[PDB]
């Protein structure tokens, strides 16, 4: 009613190894233009939206830079930035970052937040790297994220953007309660999360709704228990025989699902999100300064395992 | 490897201010005997199960001492402990504690965990006190837990009991993720939570019951632990308390749920070995957690 922001969830379909980068960016622009027609001011793109989920393939730690981005933006992604700035829409884009810092070449799983005027707001780099680093034949599919990426060095940052507080997370960050709480302690009002969740081939029946239950459970709870909007945008479909989980959702500060995807391809979900709905819980039920006792939370920052 | 425990959720009905403490203990023993006939080895009682939910009423900070317990157990609660030991059943009981620690009187919202042999294994005191400390006429009803209780000094402890790792929380502790994680970082396998949640805010019944289960299903799943939520429901002197007592599996699934707002016992077989399955399957805390980015959780209390 008051501080309303119309957010579009630009869920992506399966990206194959045979798909060129221009075909990928054009699919991003097509979802951006639909959000502009429906009056969206911010569309959220999935994790690694500029290439297929290459951590499923095995190669040398340097021989996967073809899927990385030379710059942000570069020659291939500039048409997307020009369309967003021209239509007056900001966006969060997930991609594999290739940067030159301290002489050496570094690689991160990165999402960038762009404002409606085309100016880059912030940049979050993935913290929780899932999977493994070496080849493991014991799995039906590989997940070599720890081999192709480094641990991010940005932290869970929260910026002043889109008339409020906007934070970003990447994929399996949404399963850890520390992801929401760290940004929740920065008075966050909108958490943008793109994810690529692998899923078994013949997953169906009760086991399918269980992983979708766990997918929404972590985001609905992270939204309510921190009184913030959560937007989870997926890249779904079957990528070269590997199925990716869909179910893109926009979650309210009450943990309620206000918009959910119905397909596993290129789909755009959109909901009118009132940022002022975050304030009620922050002043009563979840008043951090009045209820939290950090002297009993020391295990969360001291140890890594259980002991 | 054979660590299976049958847990009984002994949801209590309303307790009035005019109810005697003997009437309350007899209702506890009645629920305790229902669990024995159902083969339960552990029953969970609600928060403050030995009196009405008095934080709703306004009085002096010394006034509510009539509902507190001088000892645990005392002469009024000893019949409950003797029946639990006679039946060979452990239990977790919530009560208002009056201890005296060093020349001064201290007041805590407390739950005590007892083993099947009658031996007390531990004691948790409430950490997250909700509500306010002064009378606020803007509200429909008062919730003066900050006025009558102090922040506990035990912390989220996890004990070796009932063949596994058992922890305890109290009421709105289940709303905070730190409650589950601190015990989760102690390899917890069973969290016992008694609670007293009013139906009205300051209603949204369906949304409040939604938040009641969402916080416990997420804490159970994101820590791969069993979570037992037992309520004291019913209309207490015109004030309605939410029911919905529930037993959650390490998957966040509800395996038992209360259907009434009165005295009701829900029972489910809980295999503590299920926790090791999901703790090993890519919920490994020692593998993925990066504590160098979580410093805000312990550095500050509110928003900066």
Automatic annotation (TrEMBL), chain B:
Record domain CN hydrolase: where: 5-272
GO molecular function ontology, one term from the record: hydrolase activity, acting on carbon-nitrogen (but not peptide) bonds, in linear amides
Protein name, entry field: N-carbamoyl-D-amino-acid hydrolase
InterPro entries, per the entry: Aliph_Amidase/BUP, C-N_Hydrolase, C-N_Hydrolase_sf
Keywords: Hydrolase
Matching SUPFAM superfamilies: Carbon-nitrogen hydrolase
């Amino acid at each position: 009613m008051t501080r309303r922001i119309r957010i579009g969830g630009a869920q992506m379909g399966a990206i194959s190894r045979s798909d060129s980068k221009k075909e990928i960016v054009d699919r991003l622009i097509a979802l951006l233009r639909q959000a502009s027609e429906k009056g969206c001011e911010l569309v959220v793109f999935p994790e690694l939206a500029l290439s297929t989920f290459f951590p499923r393939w095995y190669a040398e730690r340097d021989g996967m830079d073809g899927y990385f981005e030379d710059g942000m933006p570069n020659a291939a992604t500039l048409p997307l930035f020009e369309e967003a700035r021209r239509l007056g829409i900001g966006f969060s884009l997930g991609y594999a970052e290739l940067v030159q810092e301290d002489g050496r070449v570094r690689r991160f799983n990165t999402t960038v937040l762009v404002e409606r005027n085309g100016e880059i707001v912030g940049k979050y780099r993935k913290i929780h790297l899932p999977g493994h680093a070496e080849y493991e034949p014991e799995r039906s599919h590989q997940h070599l994220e720890k081999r192709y990426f480094e641990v991010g060095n940005t932290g869970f940052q929260v910026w002043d953007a889109f008339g409020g507080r906007v934070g970003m997370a990447i994929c399996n960050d949404r399963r850890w309660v520390e992801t929401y709480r760290v940004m929740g302690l920065q008075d966050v009002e909108l958490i943008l999360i793109g994810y690529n969740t692998p899923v078994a081939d013949s997953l169906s029946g009760e086991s399918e709704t269980l992983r979708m239950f766990h997918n929404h459970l972590t985001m609905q709870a992270g939204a309510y228990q921190n009184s913030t909007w959560v937007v989870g945008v997926a890249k779904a479909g079957v990528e070269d025989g590997h199925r990716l989980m869909g179910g893109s959702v926009i979650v309210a500060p009450t943990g309620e699902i206000v918009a959910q995807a119905m397909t596993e391809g290129d789909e755009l979900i959109v909901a009118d999100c009132d940022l002022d709905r975050c304030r009620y819980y922050k002043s009563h039920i979840f008043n951090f300064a009045a209820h939290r006792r950090p002297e009993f939370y020391q295990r969360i920052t001291s140890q890594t395992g259980v002991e």
